[model samples]
Target chain A: EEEDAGLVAEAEAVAAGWMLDFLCLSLCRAFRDGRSEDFRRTRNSAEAIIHGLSSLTACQLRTIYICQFLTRIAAGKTLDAQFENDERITPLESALMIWGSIEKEHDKLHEEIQNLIKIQAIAVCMENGNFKEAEEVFERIFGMPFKSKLLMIISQKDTFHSFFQHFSYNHMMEKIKSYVNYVLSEKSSTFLMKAAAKVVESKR
Target chain B: EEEDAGLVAEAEAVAAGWMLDFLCLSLCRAFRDGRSEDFRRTRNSAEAIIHGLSSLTACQLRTIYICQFLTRIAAGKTLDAQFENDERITPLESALMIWGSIEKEHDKLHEEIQNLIKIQAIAVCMENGNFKEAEEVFERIFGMPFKSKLLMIISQKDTFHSFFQHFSYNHMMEKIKSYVNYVLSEKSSTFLMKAAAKVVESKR
Candidate 1:
C-alpha cells in the first residue's frame, strides 16, 4: 500500500509540473493582453490544477505564481477589483495557507510570503486611497519608525508622489516635521537622525 | 513656425499612442505563443513606430514600454539572449537614454531607472554564475556592508535560492562568517550592528 501511494504521489508531481508550465504560459498571455476576462480564465485553470496537487512544493510554487501575477497587476495604473474578487482563492490567503503547511526548514519561503502580504496590503490600501493605513502597514513590516518610513517613501519619488499627490506641499511638510520631531524626541539611531536631517535639507 | 511644430508634436503623440496600443496587443500574442520569431516581429514594429516619433514624451513612453517588456522576459526562467540582443538598442541602453532625457524634476523616474538597472545587473550576473560581481553591484547600490547585505539577501529567501543554489551549505556559511568578521572589524552603523546580532541569533 505504501509503495502504491508513493507511485501515485510521483505521478501527481509530474502532472502538477506540467500544469504549472501551462498555467505560467497562460498567465503570460493574460498579462500581455491586459484583459480581465483572460486573467479570470487563466486563474480558474490554475485553481483546478492546484486543487489536484498534494505536494507541498507544488502548492508553494502555485502560491508564488499567484502572488507574482497579483503583484504585477497591482503595480499597474488600475486595479480590477472584479477580477481580483473572482478568484476562488485570493493570492494572499493561498500564500498564508501554504505558509502554515510548510516546515521551519522553509524559512525563506515564509519571508517571501510575508513580504508579498505586505506589498499586497500596501497596494490595496493605496488603491482605495487609504494612504495613512498604507504607510502604517509598510512601517510595521520594515520595522521602521514613522519618520524613517516617510523619508524612505519620499526618497522613492514615484511612490511619494502616488501616496501624497492629494496633499498640499505645506501639508505634507507639516506632517514630516511632526514625525521628525517625534523621532528626535525618542532618540532613534544616528542613521535615522541623518536621514531626517537630509529630509529637512531637501525641503530647504 | 512654432505653432506648426506644436501641431506636429501633438499629431505625433496621437500616432504614438495608437502604435503603442497595437504593439502591446502584438506582444501579448507573441508572449502567449512563446515564439521568438513573433517577439522579433513585434519588436521591429515597435522600433519602426518609435523611429517615426519626434516627441520626447512619446520616445520616453516607448523606452518605458520596452523596458517593461524586457523586464517581464528577464524575470521568467528562461532568458532569451537572441530576443534581448536582436535590435541595435538594448533595453538597458534605451532606459539610460530615457533617464538622460528626463529633467531632474522627475526624481521618481530617475529612482525607478536606477532600480531597473540594479535588478537587471543582478539577474544577468546570477544567470552567468558571477556571484561576486552580483554582490558588488548590490553593495554599491544599497551602500550596506557585506554582512548586512548577506542578511538582506538571505532574508529575501526566493532570491537567495536563485542566486546561491550552486554553493554548498558549509561553503556558503563559511563565506558568510568571513564577511561578518570583516563587517565587525570595519565598525558599521548601529542599525547594521543590531542586524548582525539578529543574524547570529537566528542561526543559533
Candidate 2:
C-alpha cells in the first residue's frame, strides 16, 4: 500500500503537469477557433481527468479546478460577439458562475486561490468598463472588512501595504507565484500578468 | 483525509474484535442447531465485514478470514451424520474446501496463522479416524521440506525443535498466543488449546 501511494503521488504529479500543458494548448486553440463552445469544451476535457482518477489529492483537484477556472474566464470581446441568441447568458457571466459550482463542490480550495480568481473576475469586468458589476463581484467574494480596506486603497485613504498586512503576505505571494507559472507562462497572457503583478507589488 | 483514515482504522479494529467474539458464540450455537447451514451462515456473516469496508488494512482482513476459516471448520461427527444424500460431500471435506477459497482470495495471511489453521484441520480430520485425509491436508499446506521434516519428527528421526528452528519462534508463539486468546478463551475450547500447546511445548 505504501508503494501504491508512492506510485500514485508520482503519477498524479506527471498527470497534473501534463494537464497544465493540455490546458494551455486547448486555450490557445480556443483563441484560434469559433470561440463558441471552446470554454465549455475545455472545461469538460479538463474535468475528465478528475473523473478518471478520484484518487486525486485535494491539491491535485485544485490544480484541475484552477485550470478550469482560467479556461472559464477565457471569455472576452470575441466570444461575446460570436455568442448566438438572446436565450443564452454571456460567456463572461457563465465564467463567473463557475465559482458558485466550485464553492458548492469543494470548499477546501484555499482562500488565496479564491482571492486570485475573484481579482481576475474584476479585471474582466473592468475591461468592459463595468465598474458597477466589478464592485458587485467584489461584494460577493470578499468580506466587508477586506472590501472596505480595498476600497480605501482605491480612495487613497489607505495603502495596499496596510491592506495586505490584515491578510498574510506569504499566502498571497505563494498563490501569485503559483498562478503566474501555470497561467501567465502560457503565451504570457497580458491581464493575468498585470493582475498577478498588482498583488505582488503591494508587498514591496 | 487524515481524519477519514483514523475513523477507518478505529472502525476496522472494533469490527475485527467483534468478529472474534461473534465466531465463538456462533460456534457454540452451531453445536446446538441443525449444524448444516451453521458454518456457512457464520462465514457469510464474517465476510460481510470486508465487503462493507474495503478500506480495511491487510491485518483487519486477516482477522475476518481467520474467523471465517474457523467457522468453516466447525464440521464434526454430527454434521457428517446429518449429511444429505450420498451425492453430497462430507462436512469435513467441505471444511477443508474453505482453505482453498481463502488462499485464492487473499494470500497475505501470515504463515503462522496458516500453520495454526493447518494444524487444527489435521485434528478435525483425525477425529473421523481418517489418518490418510489428515496427512493429505498437511502435505497440501506445508512445503515438501517442512512436510518431510514433520514426518521425520513423527518418525522419531528428528526433534520438533529442529523442525521449528527452520521456522521463526516469535511468529509461531505470537500466533499461538493469538489463537488461544481468541478461539480457546471462548468457553476454552479443548482442541484449540491442545493444538496451540503442542506448538508451544517445542520452544521449551
Candidate 3:
C-alpha cells in the first residue's frame, strides 16, 4: 500500500510541478550513466505518465518527451544487429513514434524542441544508413534542403558510378559553398562554413 | 615555367608564413566537403611541406599535423570495406602514424593540441570497433582510466557471460558517480553531470 502511495504521490507531485524536473533528470541520467535496469524501470513509469499527459500540462509532457528522445538514441547505439534482429522496432522507429506523439500536441510544443528532435533523429538515421528516411525527414519536416541534398549524395555512394560519384562529390562542394553565399571570408557561418569554403578558395 | 614557380612559390610562401594557414585550411576543407580529388591534390603538397618541416618553425609544422589528423578522420569515415580493402592502412592506423610523428617533436607541440589529437584518435579507434587499441591509446597516451575502463567494459559486452556483464555495468556506474562525488546537485559537471546523477537519486 505504501508503494502505491509513493507512486501515486510521485505523479501527484509532478502534477503539482514539484517532481517534473526530477523525473526528467532521472530519465536522462539512466541512459547517460548506462544503467539499463534503472532506465527500464524509470521508463516504465514515464510511459504511464505519458498516458495521463492529456490532463497534464504540455510543458510537463514536453520534458518527458525529450527524455524519451534521448532514450531512443541510447537504445539505438547498440549494434544495429541486436535490434531489428528482424523483429524489434529500431531506435529510429521508436524515436519517430515519440516525435509523432509530440506532433499531435503540435501547437503546444516549442519549435526549438522539435528542431532538436529532428536533428537528433537525422544523426541517428545517418548513423544507421537509413539515408532515405534521413532525407525525407530533413526535407519534409526540417525543410532544410542543404542537409537533404548532402544526405542524398551520401546515400548514393555505393551504387553510383565513378563519374557521377565525382559529379555528386563536386555538387556537394558547390551547394555548401553557396549555402554561405560562396565566401571563405569569416562572415559566413559558425566557423565551419568559412573553413569549408577555403579548401576551394586556396587551391591554385 | 610559371607552373613550377607557382608550386615553388607555394612552398616558399609557406616558409615565409603567408600560406601555412591556407594549406591547413584546404586540408581540413577537402575532408569536410568530401572532395576526394581536392583532398588528394592538397595532401600531396601538404605532405611535401611536412618533409621540409625539419627546417621550418615548430608552429608551422604543428598547423599541418592538426589538419592531417582531421584528414585521417574524414578518410576513415568511408565504409571500412574500401579501406583495409584488406591492404591499405585503416583510418585509425593512419591517425596513429601522424600522432607518432608528432610525438617525435615531443615538447615542441602544445599539450592542448596533443590532447585534441588524442581525443580524436580515441574516437576513431572506438568507431572502428578497435576497442583494444582504443583502450590502449587512452591508457597510455591520454592517461584517462575512466574512458579506458568504459571501453574495456563495452568491449566485453559481446562475449562476457551475463552475471559478469552485470557486474561490469554496475562498476561503471559506481566509477562515474565517484568521478563527481556522487551527487545530483548543480555543483557537478557541465549541465550533464547534475542531470546524470538525478537518475539514480530520484529513482525511488
Candidate 4:
C-alpha cells in the first residue's frame, strides 16, 4: 500500500512539473513576442512555479528558471516606478525585480542577461529617439544580422510611416543618419556594404 | 540640357530604389511575423520591384534581393507542383522559382540562403513529426539560440494544447522525445542546462 502511494505521489509530482514547464514556456513565448496581455495571464502561474521549486529536481528547477527569467524580462517590471512601492506593482516592474534577484544568484548568466538588457535598451532608446545610444549598444553586439536588418527597416521614415500614422520623415531621417554614421565609423568592414551588395545581387 | 535631364533621371532612379528597399523590408517583417495577409498585399509590389531593377545601383539591387528571397520563402510558392502549369500556379512554386534563379547569380549569399532553407525545412519537418531531420539541420547552422529556444517551447504537447485546440499529446510527445534525445546526444555541454542554472542563480 505504501509503495503504491509513493508511486502515485511521484506521478502527481511529474504531472505538476510538466504543467509548470508548459506555463513557463508559454510565458517565455509571450515575453519574446511582446504580447503583454499573454504575459499577464501567465504571470501568476509562473510565480507559483518559482515558489514551488523546492519539490522539483535540479533539471526541472533549471527549466523553470529559464522560463522565469524570460518571462520576467518580457514583463519589463524593473523599469517601473511603483515596483518597490506597491505589492500590486506592474508586471514590467515585477519582471525587472525578478531579473535583478536572479542576476545576483546566477553570475554565469551575465552574458545572456546583458544580451536581453541590450535588446530592451535598444527598443526603449529607439522609441525615445535616442538614436546615438541605440546605435552604440547595437554596435557592441555585432553578430545578430537579422535583428540589425529588422532594426534598419523599422527605423526608415517610409517604413515607419506605413505602420504608424504619426510620421515625420525629416526627424526620422536625422535619427537614421546618426545611426548610419555611427555604424560606418565603428565598422568600416563590408557588413553593410555586403548587405547592400547581397541585396542588389538578389534582385538579379 | 542633356546633362540636366540625366541628373533628373538619376534622382528618379534613386527614389525608386529606396521605395523598393522599403517594400522588401516591409514584406520581410510580414513574413517573419506570419502575417500572411500583409505579405499578399506586398506581393505585387515585390514582383514589380524585381522586374524593374535595371536602373538600380548595385547597393540598391542587393537590398531588393534579400527582401525578395525572404518574401518568396514566406509565400511558400516554391514547394507547389501545379505552380506553373495552371494560371493559378501556386505562390510556393513561384517562390521556389525565384530562389532557384537568384541562387545562381548570388553565389556569395549561399550561406544566407542556406540558413533560410534550413529554417523552412525544420518547420516542415516538425509539422511532419520528422524530429530527427529537424535536429540534424538545426545542428548544421549554429548561431540561432533564441530561435531554437522558441522552437522547443512551441513543440511541447501541453503547450500546444493551450494555443492550439486540435492538439494531440501522444504524437507530439514522441516528436518532442526524439528532439530532446537528439539535443542531449549532440551537446552534453549543458548549454540549455546552464541556461536553466543561470536562471536559478539569477533568482538568488
Runs with alpha carbons beyond 4 Å of true place in candidate 3: A1-21, A49-54, A76-139, A142-145, A158-204, B1-204
Off by over 4 Å in 2: A1-44, A47-59, A76-120, A126-132, A144-146, A149-204, B1-204
Runs in model 4 lying further than 4 Å from the true structure:
A1-204, B1-3, B49-53, B77-204
DockQ of all candidates, in order?
A: 0.01, 0.01, 0.01, 0.01
Q: Which digits, one per residue and each the tens of the lDDT, describe model 3 over residues B85-178?
A: 4354556456556656763334433333444444444555555676676566556554456465555554663333343344442343233233
The per-candidate count of clashes, in order, stands at 0, 0, 1, 27
lDDT of 4 by residue, A1-204 (tens): 666334423433443354355444444444434467656655654554344234767656555555654554443424333434554443333444455554234444444444444445445445555566456545544446647563684456222323222223233323323323433333223222233334444654
Sort every candidate by TM-score, greatest first. Answer: 3, 1, 4, 2
Off by over 4 Å in 1: A1-13, A56-127, A144-204, B1-204
Worst 10 residues of 3 chain A by lDDT: A179-188
What's model 2's lDDT at B122? 45
Give every candidate's TM-score on chain A: 0.42, 0.35, 0.42, 0.40
Between candidates 3 and 4, the one scoring higher on TM-score is: 3
RMSD of each: 26.3, 23.5, 22.1, 23.8
What are the per-residue Cα lDDT tens digits for candidate 4 across B1-204? 666334433433443354354445445444544567656655655554355346666655555555655554554423333335554433333444455554234444443444344344445445555566446534543336746563673355223223222223233323323323432333323222233334444644
TM-score of each: 0.26, 0.23, 0.26, 0.25
lDDT string for model 1 (A1-204, tens) is: 666334423533453444344344444434433456655655554554455455557545644454354433433333333234445333333434444553334455445444444445455555566566556545554454534644465344344354344443333223323323432333323232334334444644
Docking quality category of candidate 2 according to DockQ thresholds: incorrect
State the C-alpha lDDT per candidate. 0.43, 0.45, 0.46, 0.44
Q: What's the lDDT for residue B186 in model 2? A: 46
lDDT by residue for model 2 over A162-183, one digit each (tens)? 4344344344335534544444
